Amino acid sequence: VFIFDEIDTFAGPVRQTLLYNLFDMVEHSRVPVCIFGCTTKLNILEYLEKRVKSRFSQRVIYMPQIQNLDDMVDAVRNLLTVRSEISPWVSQWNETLEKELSDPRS
Amino acid sequence: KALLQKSSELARTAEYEQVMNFLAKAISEHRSDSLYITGPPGTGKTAQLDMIIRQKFQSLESVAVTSINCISLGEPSSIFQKIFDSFQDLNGPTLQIKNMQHLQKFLEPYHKKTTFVVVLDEMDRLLHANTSETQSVRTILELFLLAKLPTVSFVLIGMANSLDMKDRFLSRLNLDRGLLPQTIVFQPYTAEQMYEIVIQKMSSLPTIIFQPMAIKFAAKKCAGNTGDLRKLFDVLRGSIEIYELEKLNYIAKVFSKFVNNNSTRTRIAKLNIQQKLILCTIIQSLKLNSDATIDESFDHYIKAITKTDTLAPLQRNEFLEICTILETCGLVSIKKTKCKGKTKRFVDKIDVDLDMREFYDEMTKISILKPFL
Amino acid sequence: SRFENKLKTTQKHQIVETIFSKVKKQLNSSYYLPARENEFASIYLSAYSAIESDSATTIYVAGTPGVGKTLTVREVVKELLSSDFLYVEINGLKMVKPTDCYETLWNKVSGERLTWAASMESLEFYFKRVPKTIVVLLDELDAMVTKSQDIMYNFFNWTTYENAKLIVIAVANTMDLPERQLGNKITSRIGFTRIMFTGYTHEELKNIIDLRLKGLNDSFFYVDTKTGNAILVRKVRLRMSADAIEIASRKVASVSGDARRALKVCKRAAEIAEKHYMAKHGYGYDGVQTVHITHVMKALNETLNSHVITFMTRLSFTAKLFIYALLNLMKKNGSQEQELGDIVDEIKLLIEVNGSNKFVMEIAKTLFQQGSDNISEQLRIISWDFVLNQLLDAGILFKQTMKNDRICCVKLNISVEEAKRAMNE
Amino acid sequence: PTTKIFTIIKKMLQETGKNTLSYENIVKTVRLRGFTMLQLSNCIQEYSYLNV
Numbered sequence A: 001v002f003i004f005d006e007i008d009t010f011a012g013p014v015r016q017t018l019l020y021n022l023f024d025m026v027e028h029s030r031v032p033v034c035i036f037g038c039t040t041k042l043n044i045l046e047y048l049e050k051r052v053k054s055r056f057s058q059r060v061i062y063m064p065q066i067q068n069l070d071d072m073v074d075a076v077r078n079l080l081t082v083r084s085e086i087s088p089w090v091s092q093w094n095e096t097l098e099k100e101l102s103d104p105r106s
Numbered sequence B: 001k002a003l004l005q006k007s008s009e010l011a012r013t014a015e016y017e018q019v020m021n022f023l024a025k026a027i028s029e030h031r032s033d034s035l036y037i038t039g040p041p042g043t044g045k046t047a048q049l050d051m052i053i054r055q056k057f058q059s060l061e062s063v064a065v066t067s068i069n070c071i072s073l074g075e076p077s078s079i080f081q082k083i084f085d086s087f088q089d090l091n092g093p094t095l096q097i098k099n100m101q102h103l104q105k106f107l108e109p110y111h112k113k114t115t116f117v118v119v120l121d122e123m124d125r126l127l128h129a130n131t132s133e134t135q136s137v138r139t140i141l142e143l144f145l146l147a148k149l150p151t152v153s154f155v156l157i158g159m160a161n162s163l164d165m166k167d168r169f170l171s172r173l174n175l176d177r178g179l180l181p182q183t184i185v186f187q188p189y190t191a192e193q194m195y196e197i198v199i200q201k202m203s204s205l206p207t208i209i210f211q212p213m214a215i216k217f218a219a220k221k222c223a224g225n226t227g228d229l230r231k232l233f234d235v236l237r238g239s240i241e242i243y244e245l246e247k248l249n250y251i252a253k254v255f256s257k258f259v260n261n262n263s264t265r266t267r268i269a270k271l272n273i274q275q276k277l278i279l280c281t282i283i284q285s286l287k288l289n290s291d292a293t294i295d296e297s298f299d300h301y302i303k304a305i306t307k308t309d310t311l312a313p314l315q316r317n318e319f320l321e322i323c324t325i326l327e328t329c330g331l332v333s334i335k336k337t338k339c340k341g342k343t344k345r346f347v348d349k350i351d352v353d354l355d356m357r358e359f360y361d362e363m364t365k366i367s368i369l370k371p372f373l
Numbered sequence C: 001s002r003f004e005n006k007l008k009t010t011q012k013h014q015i016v017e018t019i020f021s022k023v024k025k026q027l028n029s030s031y032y033l034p035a036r037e038n039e040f041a042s043i044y045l046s047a048y049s050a051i052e053s054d055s056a057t058t059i060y061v062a063g064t065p066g067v068g069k070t071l072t073v074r075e076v077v078k079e080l081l082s083s084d085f086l087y088v089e090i091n092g093l094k095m096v097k098p099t100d101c102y103e104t105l106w107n108k109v110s111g112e113r114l115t116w117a118a119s120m121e122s123l124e125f126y127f128k129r130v131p132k133t134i135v136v137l138l139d140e141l142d143a144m145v146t147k148s149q150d151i152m153y154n155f156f157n158w159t160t161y162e163n164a165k166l167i168v169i170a171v172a173n174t175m176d177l178p179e180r181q182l183g184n185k186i187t188s189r190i191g192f193t194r195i196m197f198t199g200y201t202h203e204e205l206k207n208i209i210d211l212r213l214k215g216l217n218d219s220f221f222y223v224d225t226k227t228g229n230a231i232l233v234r235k236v237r238l239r240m241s242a243d244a245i246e247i248a249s250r251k252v253a254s255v256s257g258d259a260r261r262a263l264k265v266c267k268r269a270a271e272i273a274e275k276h277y278m279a280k281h282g283y284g285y286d287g288v289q290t291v292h293i294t295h296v297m298k299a300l301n302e303t304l305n306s307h308v309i310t311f312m313t314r315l316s317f318t319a320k321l322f323i324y325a326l327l328n329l330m331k332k333n334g335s336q337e338q339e340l341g342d343i344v345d346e347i348k349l350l351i352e353v354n355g356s357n358k359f360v361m362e363i364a365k366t367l368f369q370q371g372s373d374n375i376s377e378q379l380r381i382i383s384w385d386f387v388l389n390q391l392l393d394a395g396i397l398f399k400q401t402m403k404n405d406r407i408c409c410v411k412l413n414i415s416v417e418e419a420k421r422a423m424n425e
Numbered sequence D: 001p002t003t004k005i006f007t008i009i010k011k012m013l014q015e016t017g018k019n020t021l022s023y024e025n026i027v028k029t030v031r032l033r034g035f036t037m038l039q040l041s042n043c044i045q046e047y048s049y050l051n052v
Ligand SMILES: Nc1ncnc2c1ncn2[C@@H]1O[C@H](COP(=O)(O)OP(=O)(O)OP(O)(O)=S)[C@@H](O)[C@H]1O
Pocket: B013, B039, B040, B041, B042, B043, B044, B045, B046, B047, B048, B160, B161, B193, B194, B197, B227, B228, B229, B230, B231, C160, C185, C188, C189
């Protein structure tokens, strides 16, 4: 498994060699591989040239965002709530959290 | 039928008669004429001198005259190293091959006092090397100086493509100095000396080579822009396999590869009528002769399609794919040009190989682009 | 060679070979050709003559990537092993420095390792001295041309020696390459063979798919109903609708004519039906099946459709507040490139030109302080460095570098109309 | 409202696989469904961007 952070900087103008070798390893190698590019430059596909993009399997996946106000409210509830029993305070602590969270005027 | 044409693909020239006059002292062991042999490219000129020296060495007295190719040096030392390789000896090499005066000590022979002439092959790599009046012209200057007192002189035979090199010489050197004067050129042989060598290179003759007047026809209608008729027989050797594949026919096959899409096959590239619309959209953005982005084109594409409602406005992502359909046929090229704000940042500037004269014919047949013009 | 013995491990716990697993095994891009059938001979008959006659020639082929020129010349030499040569894949892009290919050649004649200087001396010493057979592939020639053409002159000057036992095969990106990058002195040595490779056509793009689908199209699998494992309890079949394969062909031949792009869009569309089949029954990982036309409709569109429009409407408020200010200056001035201080000048002004609407006031409270009437009176807005950094690394915006944080110019990077259009939501 | 109508075209493309420019027997399966002659008229021009 390949883990690539900031694969856009490898996608420079001049050489692009290292991308070209791993993407051809998809095509021919008996060793099963998988490549994982992580970046933040959105239109990553135009940054590549022609001969590398044809090696590429073209499948990108966009990462989601918090699209509604209710979503992160649901997230912070799952974030702060403890579910496993450790402390005597826990059952008291869990209902204090949501009571602040359920009230929209809190 | 193969072995007659298996052998097809492989003193002799009427330019060798010139150079024996130019080497008139090379059989009397004296210093010959002053040899700076130039030429327009492809004219056989690399192998031309190689034909002479190989005929010289196979003919010729102690025999040692060496020739080295100036390709991978960029620097005038190891040429004087390679003349030492015909000696098969051992010495202190570095100082003797570096300075002008250090070459002079190297020119005292050992066995029988046969004079030496060097041959500098492909001198234009050092001519068209690093900056002229600093190193390379000085390198040119230092080699052509033959003021040595005995007749054992390092006679140069150097070669070049483009004929600017004589005017590059300093006015002292152009005062009849060294190997200068005989600027022996070689005009490209139309058919009148090169084809006849092909005749004698058909010593082993098959029955059906083909009609040799068509070979004469091949020579006459290649001599517009050419220099190498064996290589232009190597395009006959490809068409001679065409008559083997099918168990100037090929120049006809190769030019229609190049002439078309502007006259006829433009509409072949744009079977989509929207591809006809997007092709005129590029040229309307070319009024602002700027870095024609895929966005500024998309800017003029939307603001016109809202006025005339010929189609719905499509996506930028669709606009990405459709202009690449225009790309692979060879009409418009895309390059990542320069904008220098943060880093060397690459916006894409396009360029079209069509003219408005070859545009206006193919749009008056379609009155749906006529709103757009 | 060595370590492939060490790349093997033992415990392989019975991986489920489902219905669409055996498709992707042959839909792998590895394993006579229909499309470039006769041009294979045009290479080979150009190559067969020089091979069995001990000469030195040059063969120049061009074309867009995805047309088989990586493939076809491998099929040339492959049959030739049956009937004197040393095969080398001198790739251009697989060389780190351009001179490093010189090391390979001198390595691949005797087995020695010197520098690129010392190799090409003995290479030149080889190519004009040996009494009398080398096949070399100079792939992706855009890489090895870049510096000063001194490398490229060597690779064809070796061909000129009549005593040179070498056969070169150049494969480029464009036919134009010895006319817009090289000199004419190289262009004399390149010859005028110039075998052009076009794209593929959509009829042949059907004829390339079924070569992978030879023994598996409309065939039968043996399946247990409990695990989803398929074997070449039911005995099920799986069919491929050829019209959807056709509409895959009529697009890829239209835009690119690329043989990887045709296979991979079928490969992407194959796994869409894989997860929907796993969704309905859940066999995990431990009557008659098909692939609809609706799969390749999505996956071909999945090559096209974006998200920056969906990204922009799912951004923050002050992000959408930022761009709406930025288009306001671009229609005020018509200069498409505005100074950064004027934007901060505008977002101040775009507060009070709207009325005293309490939503704007609940914005304007929050826009300059996170509540907390203690700490207030902020000049520029809250997280203004943050959203401008967030719009920068997203690729939507672009900002030139200056230590002045007022007169540094800002330029848009996507089309401003779609920025105007996505703002409307 | 337009994802389905591509597939009835695919049912024709199953039948003969013809990309005709003007229609008399493609439109005949549309009027029995509920959509007018104008909606399909736009569908001719916009699927030209699909090169089908
Ligand atoms: N008149 C000729 N006689 C014998 N062989 C010839 C003749 N003309 C051409 N050839 C051969 O065909 C080749 C074509 O010439 P090129 O080598 O391509 O050009 P050139 O010899 O490099 O001269 P340049 O381009 O100015 S360096 C020669 O090298 C010879 O092998």
